[PDB]
Amino acid sequence: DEETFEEFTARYEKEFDEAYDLFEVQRVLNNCFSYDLVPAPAVIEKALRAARRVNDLPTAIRVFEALKYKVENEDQYKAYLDELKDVRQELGVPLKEELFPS
Amino acid sequence: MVQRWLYSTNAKDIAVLYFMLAIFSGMAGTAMSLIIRLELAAPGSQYLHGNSQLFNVLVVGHAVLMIFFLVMPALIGGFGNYLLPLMIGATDTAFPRINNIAFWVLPMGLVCLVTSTLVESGAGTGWTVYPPLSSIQAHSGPSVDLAIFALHLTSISSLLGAINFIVTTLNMRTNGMTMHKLPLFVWSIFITAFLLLLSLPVLSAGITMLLLDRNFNTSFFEVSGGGDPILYEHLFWFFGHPEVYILIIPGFGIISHVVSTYSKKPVFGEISMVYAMASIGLLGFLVWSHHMYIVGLDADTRAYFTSATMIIAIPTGIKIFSWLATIHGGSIRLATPMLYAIAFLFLFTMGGLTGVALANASLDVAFHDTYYVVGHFHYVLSMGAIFSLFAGYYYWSPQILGLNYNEKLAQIQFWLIFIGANVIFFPMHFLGINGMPRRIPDYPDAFAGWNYVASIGSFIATLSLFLFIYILYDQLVNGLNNKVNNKSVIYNKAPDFVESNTIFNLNTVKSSSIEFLLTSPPAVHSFNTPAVQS
Amino acid sequence: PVVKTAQNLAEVNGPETLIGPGAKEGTVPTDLDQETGLARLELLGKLEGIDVFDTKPLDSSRKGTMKDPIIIESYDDYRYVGCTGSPAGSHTIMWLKPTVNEVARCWECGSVYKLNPVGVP
Amino acid sequence: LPPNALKPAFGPPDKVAAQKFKESLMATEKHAKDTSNMWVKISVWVALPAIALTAVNTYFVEKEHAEHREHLKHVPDSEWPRDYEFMNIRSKPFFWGDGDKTLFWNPVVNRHI
Amino acid sequence: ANKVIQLQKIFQSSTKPLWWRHPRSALYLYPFYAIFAVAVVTPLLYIPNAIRGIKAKKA
Amino acid sequence: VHFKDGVYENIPFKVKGRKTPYALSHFGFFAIGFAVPFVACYVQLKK
Amino acid sequence: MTHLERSRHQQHPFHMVMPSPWPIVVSFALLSLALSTALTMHGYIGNMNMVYLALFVLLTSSILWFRDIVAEATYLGDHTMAVRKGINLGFLMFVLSEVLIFAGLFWAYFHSAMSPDVTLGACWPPVGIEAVQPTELPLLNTIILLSSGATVTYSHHALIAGNRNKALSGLLITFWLIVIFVTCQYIEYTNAAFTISDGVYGSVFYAGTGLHFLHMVMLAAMLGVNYWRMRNYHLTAGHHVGYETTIIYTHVLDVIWLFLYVVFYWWGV
Numbered sequence A: 001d002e003e004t005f006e007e008f009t010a011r012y013e014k015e016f017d018e019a020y021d022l023f024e025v026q027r028v029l030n031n032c033f034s035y036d037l038v039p040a041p042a043v044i045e046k047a048l049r050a051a052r053r054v055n056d057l058p059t060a061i062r063v064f065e066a067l068k069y070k071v072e073n074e075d076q077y078k079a080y081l082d083e084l085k086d087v088r089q090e091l092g093v094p095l096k097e098e099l100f101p102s
Numbered sequence B: 001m002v003q004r005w006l007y008s009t010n011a012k013d014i015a016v017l018y019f020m021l022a023i024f025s026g027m028a029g030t031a032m033s034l035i036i037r038l039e040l041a042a043p044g045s046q047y048l049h050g051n052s053q054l055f056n057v058l059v060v061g062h063a064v065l066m067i068f069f070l071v072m073p074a075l076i077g078g079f080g081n082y083l084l085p086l087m088i089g090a091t092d093t094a095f096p097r098i099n100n101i102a103f104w105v106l107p108m109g110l111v112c113l114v115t116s117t118l119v120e121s122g123a124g125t126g127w128t129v130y131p132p133l134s135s136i137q138a139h140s141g142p143s144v145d146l147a148i149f150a151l152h153l154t155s156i157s158s159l160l161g162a163i164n165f166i167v168t169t170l171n172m173r174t175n176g177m178t179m180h181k182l183p184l185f186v187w188s189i190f191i192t193a194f195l196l197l198l199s200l201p202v203l204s205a206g207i208t209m210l211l212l213d214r215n216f217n218t219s220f221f222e223v224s225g226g227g228d229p230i231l232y233e234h235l236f237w238f239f240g241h242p243e244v245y246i247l248i249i250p251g252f253g254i255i256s257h258v259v260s261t262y263s264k265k266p267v268f269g270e271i272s273m274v275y276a277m278a279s280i281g282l283l284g285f286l287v288w289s290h291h292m293y294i295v296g297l298d299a300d301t302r303a304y305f306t307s308a309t310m311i312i313a314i315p316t317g318i319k320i321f322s323w324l325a326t327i328h329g330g331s332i333r334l335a336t337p338m339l340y341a342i343a344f345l346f347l348f349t350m351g352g353l354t355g356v357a358l359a360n361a362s363l364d365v366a367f368h369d370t371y372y373v374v375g376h377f378h379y380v381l382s383m384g385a386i387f388s389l390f391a392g393y394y395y396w397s398p399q400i401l402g403l404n405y406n407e408k409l410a411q412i413q414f415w416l417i418f419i420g421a422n423v424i425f426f427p428m429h430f431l432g433i434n435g436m437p438r439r440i441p442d443y444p445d446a447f448a449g450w451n452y453v454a455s456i457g458s459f460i461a462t463l464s465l466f467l468f469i470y471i472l473y474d475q476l477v478n479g480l481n482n483k484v485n486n487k488s489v490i491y492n493k494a495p496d497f498v499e500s501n502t503i504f505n506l507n508t509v510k511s512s513s514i515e516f517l518l519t520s521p522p523a524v525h526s527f528n529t530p531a532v533q534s
Numbered sequence C: 001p002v003v004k005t006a007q008n009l010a011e012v013n014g015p016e017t018l019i020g021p022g023a024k025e026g027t028v029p030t031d032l033d034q035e036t037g038l039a040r041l042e043l044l045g046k047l048e049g050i051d052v053f054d055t056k057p058l059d060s061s062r063k064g065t066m067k068d069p070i071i072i073e074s075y076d077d078y079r080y081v082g083c084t085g086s087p088a089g090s091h092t093i094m095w096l097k098p099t100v101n102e103v104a105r106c107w108e109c110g111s112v113y114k115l116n117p118v119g120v121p
Numbered sequence D: 001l002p003p004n005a006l007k008p009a010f011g012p013p014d015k016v017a018a019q020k021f022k023e024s025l026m027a028t029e030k031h032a033k034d035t036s037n038m039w040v041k042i043s044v045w046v047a048l049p050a051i052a053l054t055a056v057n058t059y060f061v062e063k064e065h066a067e068h069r070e071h072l073k074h075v076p077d078s079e080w081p082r083d084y085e086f087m088n089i090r091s092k093p094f095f096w097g098d099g100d101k102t103l104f105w106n107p108v109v110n111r112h113i
Numbered sequence E: 001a002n003k004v005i006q007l008q009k010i011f012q013s014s015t016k017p018l019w020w021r022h023p024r025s026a027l028y029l030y031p032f033y034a035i036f037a038v039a040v041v042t043p044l045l046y047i048p049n050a051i052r053g054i055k056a057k058k059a
Numbered sequence F: 001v002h003f004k005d006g007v008y009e010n011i012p013f014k015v016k017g018r019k020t021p022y023a024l025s026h027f028g029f030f031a032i033g034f035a036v037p038f039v040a041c042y043v044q045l046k047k
Numbered sequence G: 001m002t003h004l005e006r007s008r009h010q011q012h013p014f015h016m017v018m019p020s021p022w023p024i025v026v027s028f029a030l031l032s033l034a035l036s037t038a039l040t041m042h043g044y045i046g047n048m049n050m051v052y053l054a055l056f057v058l059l060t061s062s063i064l065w066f067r068d069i070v071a072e073a074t075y076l077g078d079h080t081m082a083v084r085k086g087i088n089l090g091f092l093m094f095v096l097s098e099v100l101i102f103a104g105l106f107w108a109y110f111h112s113a114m115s116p117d118v119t120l121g122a123c124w125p126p127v128g129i130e131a132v133q134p135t136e137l138p139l140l141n142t143i144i145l146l147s148s149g150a151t152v153t154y155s156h157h158a159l160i161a162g163n164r165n166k167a168l169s170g171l172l173i174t175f176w177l178i179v180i181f182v183t184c185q186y187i188e189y190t191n192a193a194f195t196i197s198d199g200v201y202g203s204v205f206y207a208g209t210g211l212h213f214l215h216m217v218m219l220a221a222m223l224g225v226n227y228w229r230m231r232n233y234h235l236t237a238g239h240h241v242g243y244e245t246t247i248i249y250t251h252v253l254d255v256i257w258l259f260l261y262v263v264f265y266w267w268g269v
């Protein structure tokens, strides 16, 4: 019924205010990526900081490779490339130089 | 210690016992159908010295045994008494005495039908018992009376079970559960039970009338004496077609439950198709007479019947597309339930295609009683019942036992039954277009190669049944090994690329009921507290 | 072996101890002592409201988060409950498993539920 | 004095649902009593006289018009109904019993020897 | 009455199967419903014992 | 009547037994799987 | 242990069961009936009393089991609203099934209204055959049953309201009327109309009456077993099972019997 989508976003931030472990990060990431909506860099950075609140680099790998392979969206690459480049340069998580040469 | 297996007040023991009885009847029917197909493998008398009387005796035994003792008892009783009062939060189901009485009147039916099949005269009129085809002059002895008694007691058992299910649904509902948003399984069982309650009594009355005709030698449906057997023919149609719905709709609910608990996404148009299934249950009393197009009804009556029979056919395609959307956009796993449901849906699409081909009345004149009609209902009944039961077993065995079942054995089993069914059922199109004449112990040898491939497929099915029993032995002997190693599937659904290993370990199943994470069936006192839901 | 007044809602224990004296002549007595078994306690409870095996709804409307998790009044070790949102319905029901050995999570509310004993000596 | 430690979970506080159920049960009982009274009154007023009149006239007509079959055993073959293949046809041979080889000793069904 | 209480006390002080209720009826029924049941069941399927041995052989 | 954990006792058969370690009863099940059609044929015809 | 006590005496209505072979001996008696019927179909001995004795002992066994089970129901106690409501609902379902059987049997001979047959009849009545008319034989029985139903339409409710000497008088008159009914049914037992062997034209009404008399037979049997249960001092004004059914028995019986009496006696003659 093309319901509102920002309500679930606000639910994500209010659970972030109530976040108590990496479990909530997993739940909110699954809920957000399940939706058809493409996450803006703001909510992507919010999810990244939620995952880093426990400082788990594997969760950073998860979220980055999920952004790289979230939705086909008629095969959107260049936007994905620039977005991953900036969300990498903000903190620095070099991992594509290891799994790709396999 | 024997009261558990003779006076089971709990539903689970009765469920597994009905399952054992149904599987025994099914394996016996499969073996004797293999024997029949071997008789029909080549024209003549190679293993049985003709005996068309005996031929039709085993033919009717085939039909009656699989219809009345394989599809019916387990497929409804086990799933109903194991889920319908358990998921709703009820502590224990009522009427244990009724279920025990039904069980203990069943062996009357088994023994009487065995005696009826094992007399010199015997009843061999097939699934149709319309007089004077079912007259005592040809099929003498006590076979007809024993068959009638078995019919009566089986109808009583099924009707009482449906009554128990209905009263459990109507009264034992938990406080925190709306009626409009019930699961598809609950509504499926509801519609099936109500259709059974409105269909079985009519057939029971007709069967009682035939019993009175055979005993008191009166004149109701005999041609001599101004009788009208077409009344009982219409009664049998208004039983069978709603009985076909009774056999199929719980399979639809089971497939819906499997896809909902596996695909991890909601079923498209869930409430809309709950309403559609309610409409099907309400309107099933109007499309029961699309088989009698040649009896001599009026042209306007033919038009009404055909209009109804293709105006109530849309929800089949609606369900097909709804389940297609349910598996669309989600994650599908290379598991046996997925492939079982896919094969069942595909072969059901072909079966419904053949039925729609049969929906026309003008084509029926040259198509009725040809090979096409029997091929069509063999398609729909065979795939529906057999694959629904197989999917239910392979989807519910760890739910009721907790001992894992081998993935490799299940996959090879599926491949065997699937290839057997395809090789048997593909040539039926050519067989129908040529006009193979049905129910002939010595058919013309033109169809020799097709009979050979049908026999090969039947023998493949029988060795598949041997694989079934060997798989049961393997599970019983190595469930501990299956739990220890990875030779068997451990979890129903694979994780997505969002879940950490620990999180998925502590969130193994997120379904609509606690049954999956309910421990292996507890003692007779389970669900001591009501189920709360919001 | 003495007669029991049975005037208290909690002092009666054991349907065997209750028999119920008969009457010689008169009218049918009220539904206080003529009933046999323990059905009289149950019918009195439904007459007044104080009931065992109560079907009254729990705090389903309450979110039941870590600030104030929902309560369950039962001494049984296992738990068969569910909670998928404060309103009447917003998502498919998922069962909750309160326990003392470990913690529980809701996957939509993220609530840690604590099973609630009854006071014992 | 039964041993009770704290309380046997008396339950949630009461509400008006119990009294509503009480009112419904009392209304059902009162409806049953009222329909009993009214139906008994109307029955004894009208039905019993009408039922008695129907019974007596039916008994009279049965005593009058249903007593001519006593002499059917002995009758000349002059007013016999026009029969056909409906009667006088072969049936299953019967071997049980001794008397006339018949299921019941009613030698009146067939008047032809 | 004067016997219901005594019977209840006996049952409470002695829990045994068969309900200790119909001993004479049990002795009249169960041994009879065994011996007479055998005597009425066995001959029906023992009459064809002489005919038993059919090999479906003809000349 | 309430002493069934429900792990291996749900089956209406006894796993224990040296004479029948699920070997004699299940061989009887094997026999009765094809027994009824064979005897039905044997009553009137030959197999 | 108060919570344990409430969860064990209120949420656990389970009754202990010892390995009693009653169900298997009941099934054995049923198999005995089946083999007796098979022997009637084909047998080498011409005796008739053996099958009658087998049927009689089976009926006595069933009646004994029913009176026994109601005896343990009234005797073990442990009765709540759950057991009473469940047994009442089950008995209502059973009487509804009996009503549906009555309706089916009525429609079995009711369906000849438009006369859709083809030959040898096809216009009721099929004039041309002068057989024995079934009409006017059981009208005395149906009218006296109508009188009994009229007088007991609310006599059961009067009994449940009073439970006094008037209840005893009602039970006595019920016994007398059912005895009169069974005697007037027994008077025409063998030589009622003729032997049912050949030439059927109007035996359908007689067959219907004969099959309908059976339910009245077990009605009398259940009334007698209820009276004997009161003679055993088991069915008091507690978890009543006889009363809870006999209150609605007349209301569910009179409707269907009036349906079967307005037609099938005033029609088809």
Ligand code: HEA
Residues within 6 Å of the ligand: B019, B022, B023, B026, B027, B030, B033, B036, B037, B040, B059, B060, B062, B063, B066, B067, B071, B074, B125, B126, B127, B128, B378, B381, B382, B383, B385, B386, B389, B390, B393, B438, B439, B440, B458, B461, B465, B468
């Ligand atoms: C219930 C529907 C149904 C099903 C499933 C089948 C299944 C089959 N039928 Fe039959 N058939 C009928 C309904 C059905 N049939 C009817 C109504 C007739 C007409 C009756 C007549 O007029 O008398 C008929 C007639 C009929 C004939 C005509 C008889 C003739 O005159 O010679 C033939 C011919 O060979 C035949 C063959 C088959 C075959 C090969 C299968 C194969 O599909 C069999 C494969 C089945 C199995 C796979 C069973 C597996 C067994 C198990 C152990 C189950 C395990 C499950 C669990 C409990 C977990 N059928």
Ligand code: HEA
Residues within 6 Å of the ligand: B244, B248, B290, B291, B292, B293, B309, B310, B312, B313, B314, B316, B317, B320, B349, B351, B352, B353, B354, B355, B356, B357, B358, B359, B360, B364, B367, B368, B369, B373, B376, B377, B380, B381, B384
């Ligand atoms: C599983 C049960 C089942 C199902 C689903 C069907 C489905 C259908 N059946 Fe069939 N049928 C039987 C069970 C079943 N049947 C049995 C046992 C018999 C034998 C009885 C007797 O005759 O002896 C029988 C026989 C039978 C006959 C007897 C032929 C003759 O008179 O002798 C006819 C005739 O019209 C018929 C019609 C149909 C139709 C129109 C459908 C349709 O409902 C099919 C629905 C599916 C489709 C709709 C196709 C897929 C979806 C789409 C492509 C959507 C778009 C298409 C359209 C809406 C046009 N069936």
Ligand SMILES: [Cu+2]
Residues within 6 Å of the ligand: B241, B287, B288, B289, B290, B309
């Ligand atoms: Cu149809």
